[PDB]
Design a protein around this ligand. Structure first.
Ligand SMILES: [Zn+2]
Ligand SMILES: [Zn+2]
Ligand SMILES: [Zn+2]
Length: 178
């Protein structure tokens, strides 16, 4: 197994996957690494199993259909994996914790949003459809772009949204287009 967390790339108290060489801090894995379970399989491995059981699940889909799906166990898992892919980028630090807004010439968003809030919402089963999770994720970056205006810091929102969107299209097998 790797000697660093797959998510934050640091050493520490690491839990090792039994079916792949990845390792995780307890609360870096999503869901948080389960208490007992020998053997244990990481979210990467669980996702790969879904695909292997239903190869046709990789055929292209329309985003509108994906958003309307109810959050049954496989969709819950796919949104947890997509959230975890965003935390894997170091630039997620800017979006992780609760923001505050006091900048001359800007007003804060009407509905603030942040990664740890989406993480608790998933853990508490607060989303009934994929659309609810996706809308809160996109809201994080939209709030950032609107608040930072012409400051070059706006680019951090475009960068982390690009990671989200590429991973959304991969995980939910969105039909490729020009
Ligand atoms: Zn970690
Ligand atoms: Zn694994
Ligand atoms: Zn199948």
């Amino acid at each position: 197994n790797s000697n660093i967390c797959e998510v934050c790339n640091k050493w520490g108290r690491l839990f090792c996957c039994d079916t792949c060489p990845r390792s995780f801090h307890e609360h870096c894995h999503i869901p948080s690494v389960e208490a007992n379970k020998n053997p244990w399989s990481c979210i990467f491995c669980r996702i790969k199993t879904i695909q292997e059981r239903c190869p046709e699940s990789q055929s292209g889909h329309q985003e509108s259909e994906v958003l309307m799906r109810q959050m049954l166990p496989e969709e819950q898992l796919k949104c947890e994996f997509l959230l975890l892919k965003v935390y894997c980028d170091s630039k997620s630090c800017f979006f992780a914790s609760e923001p505050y807004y006091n900048r001359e010439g800007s007003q804060g968003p009407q509905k603030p949003m942040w990664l740890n809030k989406v993480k608790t919402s998933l853990n508490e089963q607060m989303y009934t459809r994929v659309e609810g999770f996706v809308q809160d994720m996109r809201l994080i970056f939209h709030n950032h772009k609107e608040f930072y205006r012409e400051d070059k810091f706006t680019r951090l929102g475009i960068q982390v949204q690009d990671i989200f969107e590429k991973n959304f299209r991969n995980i939910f097998a969105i039909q490729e287009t020009s």
